[PDB]
Each structure stands twice: as structure tokens, then as C-alpha cells.
């Protein structure tokens, strides 16, 4: 299947209490493999997955240099954003960045990303053509015009179609046993009477990787998405994920309701019925 590599950065200004906190985190699909935290003692890019410890000291030196440099740039970008929006120096602000690439099963480049958010809102994003920018408001439009003039799209395109996909591919090889492992969901159904006239059917998926999954209730072959309590896919803490879907159902009509599970790990669609 398709794979992704993402780096997620968060800078938070803390006026009075020193320079901004910077935290970066790297993922292949739903597996974290590195972190960096400007507040931590180590002052290094740090491993967070077994298969990244393969990389030699030159990798950790070079990766540490690059993320430190990012941290110093986004500390200045926080100051520039203050200026562009005319904000007080008294307040805490957030600059988030995401960048990375997708590859197909063939290992070929599919999609690249390079984008920022200021105070939880879209600031600037590289569009899919990796040639042009979506700028949210008139402040981001200032950065957009500067970045058009300085050919920044061309710079990021070279990273996204080059180092990004080369890195992702090397990681998918070296960590093959982790990253190209599919763990199918372990599924069951519960029944909880509310009364003699209604019951809650809860459909469970446990211990699956990756996180991508569809849990769907049907009543006689028809989607019940408006009536289904669907919780956010959630980490178990061991590298696998958890999800449930619940419907409340007329007592005597349980057999009308089917739970449908789709996961990359399932050879075939699972249909679950209440089988007491």
C-alpha cells in the first residue's frame, strides 16, 4: 500500500519566560521514529523507534543540525507573524509546521506537503502542483509574495521529490519488519439493554496497525452514520490502535443491524451480526 513520512513542529512563544519552546516529531505512517525538544537536556534529535538506531552518528549529527536550524528560523517567524498581524508582545502564540511526502506501493513519489499554521489557523501551504501557494489572509499573502520572488516552491519541491522520498524509501526498507507489518483488527460486538424496548450494539476493533480503518453500521444494507456514535481512532500505547461504533436499536431488531470493518490487514470485508 501507500506510505507517508511526516514531520510535525510546534513553536510556542512564552513572553517573559525565555525563547519559544520548539518540539518536532517524525512519523512513517502511524509510527513515530524521532523527536526533538528545545527544552530537553540532550539538545539532540532522539530515536523513538527500534529501526532508526541503525543510522550511524553522521545521521544524528546532520539531523540534529537541521532541526536546530528549523527551531531558530520558526523563532524568528513567530516574531515576524507578531509584526504582520500587529499583535502585542505580551501574549503566547503558536507556529505549527508540517512537511513530508507520500509514495505508492511501487515506491514512486505521489504527493508532497509543506505548510504552516499560526494560532491554529492555516497560514501558508504549498499546493499539490508543488509550484504555488495558498495563503490564508493578507498577512500570509506577504510571505507568499516574498516566497514567489525567492523561488521557495522550487526549493521545497527539490526536497519533497528528492531527499523526502529517498528517506521514506530507506526507512521502509530498514524498518521493513515494523512498517510493512499489517496487524488486522481483533473485533467483537457487545449488546447492552437500556430497557425491554431498546439496546446499545457496540462494535469493537482492537490491536490494529495502521490506524486507517472504517467501522460502519448498516440496517438492512443501508448506512446508519447519522445514528452511530463513532469514537476517534485511539492509540493502545503498544503501537496498535482501537476504535468502536455504537447504535441504539429497537429490542427485537438486532438481526437487521450489521457492523462492517475495512482494514488493509483484512483479506476480505468483515460483516459482524449480533450472534448471542
Amino acid at each position: 500500500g501507500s506510505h507517508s513520512m511526516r514531520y510535525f513542529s510546534t513553536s510556542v512563544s512564552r513572553p517573559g519566560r525565555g525563547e519559544p519552546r520548539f518540539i518536532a516529531v517524525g512519523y512513517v505512517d502511524d509510527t513515530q521514529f524521532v523527536r526533538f525538544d528545545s527544552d530537553a537536556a540532550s539538545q539532540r534529535m532522539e530515536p523513538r523507534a527500534p529501526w532508526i538506531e541503525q543510522e550511524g552518528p553522521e545521521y544524528w549529527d546532520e539531523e540534529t543540525g537541521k532541526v536546530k536550524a528549523h527551531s531558530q528560523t520558526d523563532r524568528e517567524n513567530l516574531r515576524i507573524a507578531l509584526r504582520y498581524y500587529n499583535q502585542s508582545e505580551a501574549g503566547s502564540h503558536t507556529l505549527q509546521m508540517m512537511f513530508g511526502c507520500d509514495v505508492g506501493s511501487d515506491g514512486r513519489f505521489l504527493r508532497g506537503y509543506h505548510q504552516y499554521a499560526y494560532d491554529g489557523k492555516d497560514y501558508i501551504a504549498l499546493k499539490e502542483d508543488l509550484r504555488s501557494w495558498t495563503a490564508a489572509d493578507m498577512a500570509a499573502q506577504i510571505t507568499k509574495r516574498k516566497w514567489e520572488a525567492a523561488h521557495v516552491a522550487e526549493q521545497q519541491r527539490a526536497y519533497l521529490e528528492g531527499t523526502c522520498v529517498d528517506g521514506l524509501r530507506r526507512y521502509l526498507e530498514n524498518g521493513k519488519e515494523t512498517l510493512q507489518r499489517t496487524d488486522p483488527p481483533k473485533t467483537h460486538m457487545t449488546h447492552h439493554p437500556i430497557s425491554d424496548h431498546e439496546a446499545t450494539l457496540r462494535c469493537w476493533a482492537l490491536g490494529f496497525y495502521p490506524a486507517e480503518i472504517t467501522l460502519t453500521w448498516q440496517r438492512d444494507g443501508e448506512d446508519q452514520t447519522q445514528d452511530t456514535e463513532l469514537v476517534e481512532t485511539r492509540p493502545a500505547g503498544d503501537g496498535t490502535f482501537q476504535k468502536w461504533a455504537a447504535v441504539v436499536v429497537p429490542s427485537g431488531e438486532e438481526q437487521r443491524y450489521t457492523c462492517h470493518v475495512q482494514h488493509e490487514g483484512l483479506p476480505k470485508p468483515l460483516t459482524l451480526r449480533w450472534e448471542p
Binding site: 514531520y7 517524525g26 534529535m45 539531523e63 537541521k66 532541526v67 536550524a69 528549523h70 528560523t73 520558526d74 524568528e76 517567524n77 515576524i80 507573524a81 504582520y84 512537511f99 509543506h114 506577504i142 510571505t143 516574498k146 516566497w147 525567492a150 521557495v152 526549493q155 521545497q156 526536497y159 531527499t163 523526502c164 529517498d166 528517506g167
Partner: peptide
């Protein structure tokens, strides 16, 4: 692999 040469707003 991190990208490099980060750009001012």
C-alpha cells in the same frame, strides 16, 4: 530526513 535551509516569513 529533515529538510534544510528554512525560510523567513
Amino acid at each position: 530526513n529533515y529538510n534544510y535551509r528554512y525560510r523567513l516569513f
